[PDB]
Write a protein that binds this ligand. Structure first.
Ligand code: NAI
Ligand code: FMN
Ligand code: SF4
Ligand code: SF4
Ligand code: SF4
Ligand code: SF4
Ligand code: SF4
Ligand code: FES
Ligand code: FES
Ligand code: MG
Lengths: 433, 217, 59, 43, 230
């Protein structure tokens, strides 16, 4: 029967990332045995239109955090050639606090990523794939290079790439410690040998991207699943999760949980089931839970009142006023300082701003100072509303979406934990007068 | 708090434009291989790796290294200065042989990262910005390293050491001092991103090649 | 608040307070103030001419 | 069959130049790079 | 012909394809506040002072970089545009030094004038301010870097008009700074122009320092005889 209602119990027969834990060989021989690099030539020979259609039918949404529909986005490079080469860029930066999915995909299933690069480049008509990986992921990048080497030797990429007739290259470029370089335009700038400063849009990368050529930027997870969707079909991928929330998803459950880990799960699984089944629940019981950040630091946190009934997909968490983000659940129990955690996140954002645009460069540092004073209680209640307005000024007025990610956790803390702030201010005034 | 590092350069007898720096011939072969990846006429794109390569041979980046990279790639030196001061992995000052980077962001802090930081400080006798007098270690704090599930974690010269308690990090320091190299990864009998006990999923053997393939392919 | 004869003041160190911003010269409704300035020998922003015509001044 | 062993130990034996050595090795299979028609944007 | 019709405050105008919102507003004689846009330099989009509201669009766009779309209705005086300008002025003035009486830019300051015209009249900033060390780029251009609003006009002029790549930005975020990173003299036959294009007192004339204020000067339009260009 269609339109399921209780999502969140899928067996290992339907998991794309079968070597998530690295128990099995991560090398090509192991990848092929699991089901990788199977019928690649057939998929390539089906053409870009067929490949684009499969992505579209699946309903695949961008796993990098924004959730833009993947098929429509990829179809933006279906234009005829204009003399410029076309490129696919894989975003392997993974800078969001709480997020470790791309690291595991790269280190334990690199051939999935390489095949995803090949199929995505064929769909876009791209000439080569640049994989921008985090600089701190030295071993992951080296495993990726070993995988690309054994794919080149076996003729799975490079000239003709198959019995296919299509030439495709895969390059790995390492960053050097910059979270802002996860942004697609800032990533493009960092590939071209500049500071990782985001561009303004328009133009979008499909018009003017890397080296000024048409480019498509895709998240590692988004690309890896591309070949499995092609082989099984978009209809199958869709058969999971609610409407407009199709497919499976990697979740990183960390913080105050008994067994922090990462796990593949159906999209619309309830948060409570995910936390209590895979992560072993909150230390101190479920009633010890204080707050949850469902999608990495860039998303507003939610209190226990919402966490017990919210689904883990895009629209459900949007209705909870937070957002799915990178599907990186950070759990905080009743034993933590909720203001201190948000202050640390704001300090991270202050240290990660590129400084290009005025609202981010000035207001995030301003919010950091205000939040550090809030932690002690130095402030007055009239500043809390003031702080709210500061965030509003920052949000939607910056080039880059780092300003949004800096302003949203503060808004969440003020929306849900204002009384704690006020009582901290009252206490500081009481013992200071 | 504040960065602490200055973003101007003042010449010193140990760091001036005449400080001796040059790539090894092997590093020149590697530079040629790096340069070839990018499209012709876009050679600058190699500023990020080649600069890193310099730091991998010298240990840090003297101003002469930046000048050499700028001259090799025919990029104006101020562009290389911009790249060097923007990215935090570039060392514009000498560091110890082992660069200890402990994560203190919120997911990593929630699992008692301060305990690790204090344990390192009391084991080495130095603070969160200083270098040990033997010039072997340098301790700093860093933002999220992407190993949050394994928090608390530390990064040392390209090796992650995760699931740390004070005793594990102390014995890693001991192993690094005595002239040995410690094995990277979790230090709690986990060796993965798996749940700490039970392996809630991925227990059944992975499906074979072509198991779920759709008709007409 | 009594308004009388004009005076130029100093900081407690003995350094003059005036920095030659010329706001007094701009605001003066009688145009009674004449100011000329240059960098001092130590680079300080100080006046070399500061006149008030007391028969122009309206106090 | 076994799922009790984390095979992934290749990285333990990785040195400082392993990534660049692999890049040099891979430089052989690469397709010819395209060209904009200039030596540089300042040419 | 190829002209497209767009509306500035409900008023029709015909513009060439690819024309930015700022130029369309300029066609009807309205000047959008700016700090980083200069019509003779490459577009930057960093200051964010030019943000305006397009009718039936939730997000304000940067007028200096965004090309007008056919049928668009700019709204240069809506509540959203005014609040954007007020917020951006607030962020600009947060770390700015209280230097107007000693600043040579005093009566000629774009920051001062746009604060008076489009910003608020008050401060709600209760923290300490940042301070940066001064750079020495020669005997012609005095440098007081604390005043810099990070427009990057100097960097674009030096790179594109003068042909020199000596200026740049080091560091990132709040600590990002404009300079040369080394003791270097920005010496060129067109160097002094970076004083004119810098909107604040960060870059000033060293020979002119402290001598005059703009309201007292008399302007005589004349010709140069130092060469044959006139
Ligand atoms: N994986 C990680 O570690 C991190 C993830 N993030 C996530 O990034 C999200 C926001 O990032 P954004 O790049 O600003 O998302 P976005 O809203 O700007 O769009 C995302 C994708 O859709 C494309 N797109 C959107 N509109 C388009 C159009 N009209 N035409 C053509 N293409 C279009 C964009 O080019 C981009 O590729 C956040 O929600 C965050 O969760 C943030 C930091 C780190
Ligand atoms: C500050 C910032 C950092 C980001 N970092 C990453 C990242 O590390 N990895 C990623 O896949 N996307 C990151 N993104 C989102 C990218 O825009 C996204 O990857 C891109 O739009 C394509 O992702 P998709 O495949 O999910 O559509 C970041 C966005 C911002 C604003
Ligand atoms: S929002 Fe922050 S990170 Fe993004 S471009 Fe602006 S200053 Fe840079
Ligand atoms: S010039 Fe006039 S207003 Fe300015 S400091 Fe001197 S006395 Fe005061
Ligand atoms: S008229 Fe006299 S009192 Fe009035 S502003 Fe001029 S100098 Fe001062
Ligand atoms: S640059 Fe303008 S706002 Fe800044 S101190 Fe000088 S006059 Fe005042
Ligand atoms: S010195 Fe002037 S022109 Fe240069 S970046 Fe600063 S404000 Fe802009
Ligand atoms: S917060 Fe420590 S590795 Fe992510
Ligand atoms: S004038 Fe448009 S962003 Fe500065
Ligand atoms: Mg000026």
């Amino acid at each position: 029967a269609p339109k399921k209602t209780s999502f969140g119990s899928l067996k290992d027969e339907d998991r794309i990332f079968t070597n998530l834990y690295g128990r099995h060989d991560w090398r090509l021989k192991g990848a092929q045995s699991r089901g990788d690099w199977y019928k690649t030539k057939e998929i390539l020979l089906k053409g870009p239109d067929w490949i684009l259609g499969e992505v579209k039918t699946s309903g695949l949404r961008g796993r990098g955090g924004a959730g833009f529909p993947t098929g429509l986005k990829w179809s933006f490079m279906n234009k005829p050639s204009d003399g410029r080469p076309k490129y696919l860029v894989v975003n392997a930066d993974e800078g969001e606090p709480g997020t470790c999915k791309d690291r595991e995909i790269i280190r334990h299933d690199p051939h999935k990523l390489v095949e995803g690069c090949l199929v995505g480049g064929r769909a876009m008509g791209a000439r080569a794939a640049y994989i921008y990986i985090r600089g701190e992921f030295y071993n992951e990048a080296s495993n990726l290079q070993v995988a690309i080497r054994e794919a080149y030797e076996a003729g799975l990429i490079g000239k003709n790439a198959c019995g296919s007739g299509y030439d495709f290259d895969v390059f790995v470029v390492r960053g050097a410690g910059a979270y802002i370089c996860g942004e697609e335009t800032a990533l493009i700038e960092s590939i071209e040998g500049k500071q990782g400063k985001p561009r303004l849009k328009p133009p979008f990368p499909a018009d003017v991207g890397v080296f000024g050529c048409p480019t498509t930027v895709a998240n590692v997870e988004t690309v890896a699943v591309s070949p499995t969707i092609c082989r099984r079909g978009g209809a199958w991928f869709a058969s999971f999760g609610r409407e407009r929330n199709s497919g499976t998803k990697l979740f990183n459950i960390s913080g105050h949980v008994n067994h922090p880990c990462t796990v593949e799960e159906e999209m619309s699984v309830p948060l409570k089931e995910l936390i209590e089944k895979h992560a072993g629940g909150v230390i101190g019981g479920w009633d010890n839970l204080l707050a949850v950040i469902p999608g990495g630091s860039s998303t507003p946190l939610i209190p226990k009142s919402v966490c017990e009934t919210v689904l883990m997909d895009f629209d459900a968490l949007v209705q909870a006023q937070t957002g799915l983000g990178t599907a990186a659940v950070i759990v905080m129990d009743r034993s933590t300082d909720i203001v201190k955690a948000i202050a640390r996140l704001i300090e991270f954002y202050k240290h990660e701003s590129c400084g290009q645009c005025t609202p981010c460069r000035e207001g995030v540092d301003w919010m950091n100072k205000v939040m550090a004073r809030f932690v002690k209680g130095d402030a007055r209640p009239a500043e809390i509303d003031s702080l709210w307005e500061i965030s509003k000024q920052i949000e939607g007025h910056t080039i880059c979406a780092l300003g949004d990610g800096a302003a949203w956790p503060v808004q969440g803390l003020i929306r849900h934990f204002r009384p704690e702030l006020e009582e901290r201010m009252q206490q500081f005034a009481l013992q200071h007068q | 708090g504040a960065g602490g590092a200055l973003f101007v350069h003042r010449d010193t007898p140990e760091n001036n434009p005449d400080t001796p720096f040059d790539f090894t011939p092997e590093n020149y072969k590697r530079i040629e291989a790096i340069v070839k990846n990018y499209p012709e006429g876009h050679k600058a794109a190699a500023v990020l790796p080649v600069l890193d390569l310099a730091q991998r041979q010298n240990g840090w980046l003297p101003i002469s290294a930046m000048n050499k990279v700028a001259e090799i790639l025919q990029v104006p030196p101020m562009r290389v200065y911009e790249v060097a001061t923007f990215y935090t992995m570039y060392n514009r000052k000498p560091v110890g042989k082992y660069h200890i980077q402990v994560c203190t962001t919120t997911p990593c802090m929630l699992r008692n990262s301060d305990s690790i930081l204090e344990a390192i400080q009391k084991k080495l006798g130095i603070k969160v910005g200083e270098t040990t007098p033997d010039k072997l270690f340098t301790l700093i704090e860093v933002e999220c390293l992407g190993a949050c599930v394994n928090a608390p974690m530390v990064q040392i010269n390209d090796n992650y050491y995760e699931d740390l308690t004070p005793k594990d990090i102390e014995e890693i320091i001991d192993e690094l001092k005595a002239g040995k190299i410690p094995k990277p990864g979790p230090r709690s009998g986990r060796f993965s991103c798996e749940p700490a006990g039970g392996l809630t999923s991925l227990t059944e053997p992975p499906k074979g090649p072509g198991f779920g393939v759709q008709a007409g392919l | 608040r009594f308004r009388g004869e004009h005076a130029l003041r100093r900081y407690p160190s003995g350094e003059e307070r005036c920095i030659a911003c010329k706001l007094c010269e701009a605001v003066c409704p009688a145009q009674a103030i004449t100011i000329e300035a240059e960098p001092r020998a130590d680079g300080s922003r100080r006046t070399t001419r500061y006149d008030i015509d007391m028969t122009k001044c309206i106090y | 069959f076994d799922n009790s062993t984390y095979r992934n130990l290749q990285h333990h034996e990785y040195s400082t130049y392993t990534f660049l050595d692999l890049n040099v090795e891979l430089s052989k299979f690469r397709m010819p790079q395209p060209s904009s028609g200039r030596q540089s944007p300042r040419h | 012909s190829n002209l497209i019709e767009v509306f500035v405050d409900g008023q029709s105008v015909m513009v060439e394809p690819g024309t930015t919102v700022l130029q369309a507003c300029e066609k009807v004689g309205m000047q959008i506040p700016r700090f980083c846009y200069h019509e003779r330099l490459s577009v930057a989009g960093n200051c964010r002072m030019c943000l305006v509201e397009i009718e039936k669009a939730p997000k304000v766009v940067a007028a200096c970089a965004m090309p007008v779309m056919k049928g668009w209705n700019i709204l240069t005086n809506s509540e959203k545009s005014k609040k954007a300008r007020e917020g951006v002025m607030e962020f600009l003035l947060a770390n700015h030094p209280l230097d107007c009486p000693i600043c040579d830019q005093g009566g000629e300051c774009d920051l001062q004038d746009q604060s008076m015209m489009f910003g608020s009249d008050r401060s709600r900033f209760l923290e300490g301010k940042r301070a940066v060390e001064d750079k020495n780029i020669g005997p012609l251009v005095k440098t007081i870097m604390t005043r810099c609003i990070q427009c990057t006009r100097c960097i674009r002029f030096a790179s594109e008009i003068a042909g020199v790549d000596d200026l740049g930005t080091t560091g990132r975020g709040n600590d990002m700074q404009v300079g040369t990173y080394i003791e270097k003299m920005f010496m060129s036959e067109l160097s002094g122009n970076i004083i004119d294009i810098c909107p604040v007192g960060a870059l000033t004339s060293k020979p002119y320092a402290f001598t005059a204020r703009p309201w007292e000067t008399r302007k005589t339009e004349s010709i140069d005889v130092m060469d044959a260009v006139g």
